[PDB]
DNA sequence: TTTTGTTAAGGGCTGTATCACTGTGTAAGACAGGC
DNA sequence: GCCTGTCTTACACAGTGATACAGCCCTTAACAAAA
DNA sequence: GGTTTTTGTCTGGCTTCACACTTGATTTGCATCACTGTGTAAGACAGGCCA
DNA sequence: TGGCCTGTCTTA
DNA sequence: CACAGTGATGCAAATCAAGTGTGAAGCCAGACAAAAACC
């Protein structure tokens, strides 16, 4: 399966959040990522998601 | 070692194989299988690989990624797949997944044998009278050795049956799991064996036209395990009772025959051996092994599943139009109509066998009308003991029919018009129909049914009909009548009124008397010497029936469909074996054991 | 027993062998106790003949997941006649009990259906088809094709459903994609090649007799069967696909199902004419359609061979079968056909027939009805479907055997010497023959004609048998030669490709049938009554012409669709909504799916 | 030095090819009304 | 020197659950061929 | 009584899952739809014996 | 020649 | 009349997918003694 727009976003933004706070738990890092990205601009994420989606669709 | 093929691994491990076979033969008597299984399971557990060890244990218990042949059987039977169809699905899924998810056809037959009568051993003490003691008997010819030569009476029927005891054995073994768990649930010990008492609803109906296309009629004689109690000290604690007594699912088939329920000669010929067997079981104990421990059962048979026509036929009584309208009492239609409520259950099988002998012997040399009054309808010799009951449906229907007539007659005001003609009453009926359509949205029908009765027997419907009645004094009476009906209805509609409605159960006789009184005072116009069996049973015998049976609701129109289904799709198209296959299939289809698998998602 | 005791106990009883195994593993297998015990147990399982549990252990150790693709689930559901509720029970049970989702849920099966049904893939026609829509998302369409239904109009008493003929052609080609690519490969051609493919489509139509479940209820099926696909690779046409069982119900793709009588000409024509229009339109265009990523072009050739004689006559304007004009290929009368046994040629045609209907209609030489009828050769009604009437290998045999049987009876009665005979004499002749066949040939007697009686009777052995009942040996010689000619002709009409299998038989068929008829005319004069059957006429007159037209006989047989009715009723009972508009399209969809080659491949996976 | 094939005689599960059997669709004939 | 439905069974085959038969991978030792 | 077994006891340091949290687009679960054919029994209806 | 008491058939 | 049982339907609720650090759960070893059946 291809990642959600939010999912690819979080894979890319895990380093920024991690470098600023190293010992944040998974619950905490995800809660943050989710809260700030929910507050957000995010259109390129949806574009990448749609492209990966149709690529996977083609994949038989 | 694992990237290697079979000959390679055999060679490179030959030495350890010889050492392991030597150790196994020298320590466990050559049981290499058990040694390797335990070695590998213990190694897996040693490596903290509990998941794979548990899945291996489950594959040896047959619970994961391989269906137990019994579960295959539950699926196949319960989805009506033929053997050809089932094998196609089996071979295909195996070829495409490589794994043998469904089991082969021979495995399903072997799993069938366990679930069919004639597999487990048992004993009757004392041995049953005129019944074979052989316990390996299954499906046997329903004709029970009836002569078939051209000289003898012509036999137009094919039937197949179980021996009634063997079937009881298979049904108990089928429910073993429920019995043990119910013993646990009552805080009792698994190993107790003290006398279990099994109550058994016995049942019989004709199944209409079975033909695949001349009419081909079928009779189904069947039973239902209703309750199993165990004796602890001197309390009888129930270990099991069926949740859905009336379901097609727990109605265990005993004999299926291709005959007319009104073909008396054939019916008695085919059913009489079964009754003989049941009589035998009425005075004997059954010893049967459950869970390693021998358990002892004793039975109570209650033929409550017989509609009125079949009751009358098997108990020697007259046809339904008779003046002797009740199979519980000796009332006549005129008596029951004039005498509203004070009637009691009188009749019994023995009383009917003696009333037949009286008819037959005419001991006081009376005329046919005097003799007929003497024996109160018993002109034929009974041959089955029934427990004739009432259906909650028929209580509602009889009441609603009376209320419908009262409504239309109160609209026409029939007391003021004793010589009213047919067309005036017809217009009264039309008036009521129209107003009930406008106010209650009730499409007038010409055949009384449960849904019409359910919507009409409301207090609001009475208000609606009062809107067409001039005198309000009669509004009082109609509303009180409907209130009494609504008080009596729960008693016969519940499945256990001694808990769900004990106030109403108590007040039932007071209410029935008041209801009859109000009919006999304010509503005299609807007395004309006629009453229905259903209405008579509702007003006269309901509390007695609850006293006897506990419930009205608890004690077959899918029977036809299910019979035809099996015959067409799951049976050899040969007179010799169609009935065998149909009976075997229906029996499997009623097993609680397979049903559990089919419910696994709960 | 080891399995009786607990893990601490079994550890105790096996400690010694455990230490020995650890030594063996460290000394030979690098310390993998796990792998060593696994292999020991697997091979022990294989030794006790318990391969099932061993393979299940292998698959659970490999972790190879067991999941059926929704398409395979659909192939099983379809091909075993399970309703949606019954499939759902089996699905939910297997998932609850194995905890794995082996079968897929119902919504996944619907979705997989959409791929296999008409109306899913896109396509184009170049040039666009005349009077046919260019929309590609069409599926099931109402078979009445907008037929007026108001109370003023003619009363519409039938329910019918169909596909759009181009759209169904598309769906069937996409279904065969894997077979097309594999056939190109097997012919040493390229998967990606796109040069013009040619599709020989067989068209069919029949009544399904009664369909009622219990007043009769008749049905008509209009079908087509992709017979072969070729590709032009040079000045050569390479055969990349050829239907292996052309008469099977498995490849008879249902185009239109209708609840109507095949004899009800007004409804027949109302319902079929749209289909014929789309088929015409397609005769003048090329189909482009993407397969495996490469666009391909397909040219079609429609041949209406799937019509029994009754339906041929009805749709081609000819008279009913009792007519004097017995041939649907030529203008012979029964008397002419009886007198002139072999020399006829295939002269009728859809154009000739349309013409003769105009002649009948306009009566241009002002003739009497008998003269006009004679002029137009029995084409008294306007044809409305171009067909290709043929014969099946069965009726050739049947006609020959009926003749030989009558000859046997008469030769036992020496009618070549005695002209007259009572009923009793002929009855005793027949009794003699039947007894003698039952005795020496083990032939049961039969009261009505049939195929395998013919098959078993048309042997030289039976001729020796019957010769034991004939005194004159000149007549022995005659019978033996007449049967010899029969046997010299039979291969041609029985074989699947006579041009290849029996080239000499096909080359000498015409000569042999001439000598056959000459023998009958010289040394068998008595068996001439001015009567003859269409089967015998076509066998003696039209077999080489039909072979030249079609390549073969036995493969355009009438044999297969007798299952069709059964198929239909099954789908109507067990897989159909119980509402007249919906049951029909549900049977249609189920019938489509039942024919798909994709799904059949899953159902033949073991091979 | 490590993987597989191989021989021969022969022993169980499994897969499929029938059994026997009858209902049933289709069609080969027979037949009778056109008062 | 008729036409044309209706009627009647012959007939084949479909398709059931049971059953019989064949083919399956092995199981003993040893050489040894490919790698 | 001796001679054989089952099944515990005490630790930790290990290995192998399940849970933790979020977002939103898929996937499942489940009850429902509209709809007629068929069985059944409630209720018209034909009927012949005797006055 | 009936009511009409009984058993068969019909329709919702 | 009711109702059986069809394929479609529609909405609520799992579910997936990623990150990883926990906690829980079960197992190991070796000298040895209880609670138990075998001569
Ligand atoms: Mn009944
Ligand atoms: Mn036809
Ligand atoms: Zn009573
Ligand atoms: Zn011709």
Swiss-Prot record, chain A:
One of its GO terms (biological process) is positive regulation of interleukin-8 production. It comes from the Eukaryota. The modification Cysteine sulfonic acid (-SO3H) is found at residue 10. This is High mobility group protein B1. It comes from Homo sapiens (Human). Multifunctional redox sensitive protein with various roles in different cellular compartments. In the nucleus is one of the major chromatin-associated non-histone proteins and acts as a DNA chaperone involved in replication, transcription, chromatin remodeling, V(D)J recombination, DNA repair and genome stability. Proposed to be an universal biosensor for nucleic acids. Promotes host inflammatory response to sterile and infectious signals and is involved in the coordination and integration of innate and adaptive immune responses. One of its GO terms (cellular component) is nucleus. Interacts (fully reduced HMGB1) with CXCL12; probably in a 1:2 ratio involving two molecules of CXCL12, each interacting with one HMG box of HMGB1; inhibited by glycyrrhizin. Associates with the TLR4:LY96 receptor complex. Component of the RAG complex composed of core components RAG1 and RAG2, and associated component HMGB1 or HMGB2. Interacts (in cytoplasm upon starvation) with BECN1; inhibits the interaction of BECN1 and BCL2 leading to promotion of autophagy. Interacts with KPNA1; involved in nuclear import. Interacts with SREBF1, TLR2, TLR4, TLR9, PTPRZ1, APEX1, FEN1, POLB, TERT. (Microbial infection) Interacts with adenovirus protein pVII; this interaction immobilizes HMGB1 on chromatin, thus preventing its release from cell and subsequent inflammation activation. HMG box 2 mediates pro-inflammatory cytokine-stimulating activity and binding to TLR4. However, not involved in mediating immunogenic activity in the context of apoptosis-induced immune tolerance. Keywords: Acetylation, Adaptive immunity, ADP-ribosylation, Autophagy, Cell membrane, Chemotaxis, Chromosome, Cytoplasm, Disulfide bond, DNA damage, DNA recombination, DNA repair, DNA-binding, Endoplasmic reticulum, Endosome, Host-virus interaction, Immunity, Inflammatory response, Innate immunity, Isopeptide bond, Membrane, Nucleus, Oxidation, Phosphoprotein, Repeat, Secreted. It is found in: Nucleus; Chromosome; Cytoplasm; Secreted. Residues 1-60 bind DNA. Ubiquitous. Expressed in platelets. The keyword Nucleus applies.
Curated annotation (Swiss-Prot), chain C:
Keywords: Chromatin regulator, DNA recombination, DNA-binding, Endonuclease, Hydrolase, Isopeptide bond, Metal-binding, Multifunctional enzyme, Nuclease, Nucleus, Transferase, Ubl conjugation, Ubl conjugation pathway, Zinc, Zinc-finger. This is V(D)J recombination-activating protein 1. Its cofactor is Mg(2+); Mn(2+). GO terms for molecular function: endonuclease activity; histone binding; identical protein binding; metal ion binding; protein homodimerization activity; sequence-specific DNA binding; ubiquitin protein ligase activity; ubiquitin-protein transferase activity. Changing residue 309 to A: Impaired cleavage (defective in hairpin formation). It is found in: Nucleus. GO terms for biological process: adaptive immune response; B cell differentiation; chromatin organization; DNA recombination; negative regulation of T cell apoptotic process; negative regulation of thymocyte apoptotic process; positive regulation of T cell differentiation; pre-B cell allelic exclusion. Disruption phenotype: Mice display a severe combined immunodeficiency phenotype. The have a small lymphoid organs that do not contain mature B and T-lymphocytes. The arrest of B- and T-cell differentiation occurs at an early stage and correlates with the inability to perform V(D)J recombination. The frequency of homologous immunoglobulin pairing is much lower. No obvious neuroanatomical or behavioral abnormalities have been observed. It comes from Mus musculus. Belongs to the RAG1 family. It catalyses: S-ubiquitinyl-[E2 ubiquitin-conjugating enzyme]-L-cysteine + [acceptor protein]-L-lysine = [E2 ubiquitin-conjugating enzyme]-L-cysteine + N(6)-ubiquitinyl-[acceptor protein]-L-lysine. Changing residue 573 to A: Moderately defective with 56% of activity. Changing residue 319 to Q: Impaired cleavage. Changing residue 411 to Q: Loss of DNA-binding. The keyword Transmembrane does not apply. Changing residue 535 to A/L/F: Capable of nicking but defective for hairpinning. Changing residue 571 to A/W: Capable of nicking but defective for hairpinning.
């Amino acid at each position: 399966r291809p990642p959600s727009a939010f999912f690819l976003f979080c894979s890319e933004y895990r380093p920024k959040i991690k470098g600023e706070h190293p010992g944040l738990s998974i619950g905490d890092v995800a809660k943050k990522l989710g809260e700030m990205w929910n507050n957000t601009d995010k259109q390129p994420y949806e574009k990448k998601a749609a492209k990966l989606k149709e690529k996977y669709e083609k994949d038989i | 070692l694992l990237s290697l093929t079979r000959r390679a691994q055999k060679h490179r491990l030959r030495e350890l194989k010889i050492q392991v076979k030597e150790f196994a033969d020298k320590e466990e008597g050559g049981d290499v299988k058990a040694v390797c299984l335990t070695l590998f399971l213990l190694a897996l557990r040693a490596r903290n690989e509990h998941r794979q060890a548990d899945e291996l244990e489950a594959i040896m218990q047959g619970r994961g990624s391989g269906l137990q042949p019994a579960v295959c059987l539950a699926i196949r039977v319960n989805t009506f797949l033929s053997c050809s169809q089932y094998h196609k699905m089996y071979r295909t899924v195996k070829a495409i997944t490589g794994r043998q998810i469904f089991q082969p056809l021979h495995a399903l037959r072997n799993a069938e044998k366990v679930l069919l009568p004639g597999y487990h051993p048992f004993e009757w003490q004392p041995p049953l009278k005129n019944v074979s003691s052989r316990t390996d008997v299954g499906i046997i010819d329903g004709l029970s050795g009836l002569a078939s030569s051209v000289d003898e009476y012509p036999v137009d029927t094919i039937a197949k049956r179980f021996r009634y005891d063997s079937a009881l054995v298979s049904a108990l073994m089928d429910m073993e799991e429920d019995i043990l768990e119910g013993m646990r649930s009552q805080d009792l010990d698994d190993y107790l064996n003290g006398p279990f008492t099994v109550v058994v609803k016995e049942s019989c109906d004709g199944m209409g036209d079975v033909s695949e296309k001349v009419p081909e009629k079928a009779v189904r004689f069947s039973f239902t395990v209703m309750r199993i109690t165990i004796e602890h000290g001197s309390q009888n604690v129930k270990v099991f009772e069926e949740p859905k007594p009336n379901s097609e699912l727990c109605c265990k088939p005993l004999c299926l025959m291709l005959a007319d329920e009104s073909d008396h000669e054939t019916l008695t010929a085919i059913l009489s051996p079964l009754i003989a067997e049941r009589e035998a079981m009425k005075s004997s104990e059954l010893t049967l092994e459950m869970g390693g421990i021998p358990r002892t059962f004793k039975f109570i048979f209650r033929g409550t599943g017989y509609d009125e026509k079949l009751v009358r036929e098997v108990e020697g009584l007259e046809a339904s139009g008779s003046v002797y309208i009740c199979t519980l009492c000796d009332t006549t239609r005129l008596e029951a109509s004039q005498n509203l409520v004070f009637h009691s259950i009188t009749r019994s099988h023995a009383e009917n066998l003696q009333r037949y002998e009286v008819w037959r012997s005419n001991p006081y040399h009376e005329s046919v009308e005097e003799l007929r009054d003497r024996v109160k309808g018993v002109s034929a010799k009974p041959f089955i003991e029934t427990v004739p009951s009432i259906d909650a449906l028929h209580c509602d229907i009889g009441n609603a029919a009376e209320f419908y007539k009262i409504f239309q007659l109160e609209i026409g005001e029939v007391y003021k018009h004793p010589n009213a003609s047919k067309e005036e009453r017809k217009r009264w009926q039309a008036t009521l129909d129209k107003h009930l359509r406008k106010r209650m949205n009730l499409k007038p029908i010409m055949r009384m049914n449960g849904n019409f009765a359910r919507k009409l027997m409301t207090q609001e419907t009475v208000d609606a009909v009062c809107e067409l009645i001039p005198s309000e004094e009669r509004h009082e009476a109609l509303r009180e009548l409907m209130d009494l009906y609504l008080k009596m209805k729960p008693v016969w509609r519940s499945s256990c009124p001694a808990k769900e409605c004990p106030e109403s159960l108590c007040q039932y006789s007071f209410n029935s008397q008041r209801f009859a009184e109000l009919l006999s005072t304010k509503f005299k116009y609807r007395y004309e010497g006629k009453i229905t069996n259903y209405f008579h049973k509702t007003l006269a015998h309901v509390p007695e029936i609850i006293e006897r049976d506990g419930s009205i609701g608890a004690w077959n129109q899918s029977g036809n469909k299910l019979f035809r289904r099996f015959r067409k799709m799951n049976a050899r198209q040969s007179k010799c074996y169609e009935m065998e296959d149909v009976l075997k299939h229906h029996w499997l289809y009623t097993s609680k054991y397979l049903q559990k698998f089919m419910n696994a998602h709960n």
